[PDB]
Design a protein around this ligand. Structure first.
Ligand SMILES: [Fe+3]
Ligand SMILES: [Fe+3]
Ligand SMILES: [Fe+3]
Ligand SMILES: [Fe+3]
Length: 308
């Protein structure tokens, strides 16, 4: 039996855990919380951690554990199972990217078509979208987007975009609220994450939705994907079962379990999502270095400078 510190969505972790125990007979105990909290706990606990695996929504959280010497090597053959072009790789081969979530533009297709959409996410922060583009400055993926813009285009472009949103955008408190505002006709478009639309479409039926998605693609900053993943703790005294769980997460069956529970893009090529997601490779996501705490702090300051 193993203990998994879980930063991923609980329903998703519960589903992959249940599929693991059904396939192997090895029981999984989840200890859930926020990834950066669990990461900090794993560093404090050090060689006395009870954690066998760290399962996360954000592979950026692994960098600090890796450089603190806290993560175990995993099999190169497992890592290759999800190593599509564009997928982040652990340089020390001590964690694995498993699935992703994408930034996207949702839009009311009864008011707009793909003709009205922009080539770059940068262009939505312009006077043509005055009063007409929703955004959610508070979510974690919004912060990652700012970090991505700074790294790919510099602080001046990132700040200009934030200022553009302040002036031209409509602020919503949560992503679900932005999505509903497009559906209900309050605003013709919003910047959101993919799974919100795919979840709504699964429950209500796409035929009953006014909104559709537009992916910028072309390695645009707006094509940003955030990656979920897993690591084995070096301090684990049950390496065989821990490695077995991570191998399972990268297997056809483990990926199937994940993609049914949550509308993340699988990173195995031979797995198809029931949420009707396009293949990861078609997103054409940019390659971006992992977010550090310092990147966050810098981005937070940009958001404040822009007036939010
Ligand atoms: Fe969120
Ligand atoms: Fe959230
Ligand atoms: Fe989210
Ligand atoms: Fe959310």
């Amino acid at each position: 039996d193993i203990t998994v510190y879980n930063g991923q969505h609980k329903e998703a972790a519960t589903a992959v855990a249940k599929a693991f125990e059904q396939e192997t007979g090895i029981k999984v105990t989840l200890n859930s919380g926020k990834s950066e909290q669990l990461a900090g706990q794993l560093k404090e606990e050090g060689d006395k951690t009870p954690a066998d695996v760290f399962y996360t929504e954000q592979t950026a959280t692994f960098a600090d554990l890796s450089e603190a010497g806290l993560l175990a090597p995993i099999s190169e053959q497992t890592i290759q199972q999800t190593a599509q072009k564009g997928v982040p790789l652990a340089p020390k081969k001590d964690w694995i990217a498993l699935s992703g979530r994408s930034r996207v533009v949702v839009y009311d297709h009864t008011k707009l078509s793909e003709k009205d959409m922009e080539k770059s996410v940068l262009d939505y922060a312009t006077p043509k979208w005055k009063g007409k583009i929703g955004y959610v400055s508070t979510s974690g993926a919004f912060l990652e987007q700012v970090v991505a813009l700074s790294k790919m285009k510099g602080d001046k472009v990132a700040l200009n975009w934030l200022k553009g949103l302040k002036e031209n955008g409509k602020l919503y408190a949560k992503l679900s609220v932005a999505l509903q505002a497009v559906e209900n006709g309050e605003v013709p478009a919003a910047l959101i994450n993919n799974y919100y639309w795919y979840n709504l479409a699964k429950e209500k039926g796409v035929e009953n939705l006014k909104s559709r998605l537009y992916f910028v693609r072309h390695q645009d900053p707006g094509a940003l994907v955030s990656y979920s993943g897993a690591a084995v703790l070096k301090a684990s005294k049950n390496q065989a079962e821990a490695q077995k769980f991570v191998d399972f997460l990268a297997s056809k069956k483990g990926q199937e379990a994940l993609v049914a529970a949550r509308a993340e893009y699988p990173l195995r090529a031979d797995v198809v999502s029931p949420f009707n997601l396009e293949p990861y490779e078609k997103l054409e996501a940019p390659v971006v270095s992992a977010t550090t705490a310092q990147d966050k702090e810098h981005a937070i300051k940009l958001i404040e400078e822009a007036g939010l």
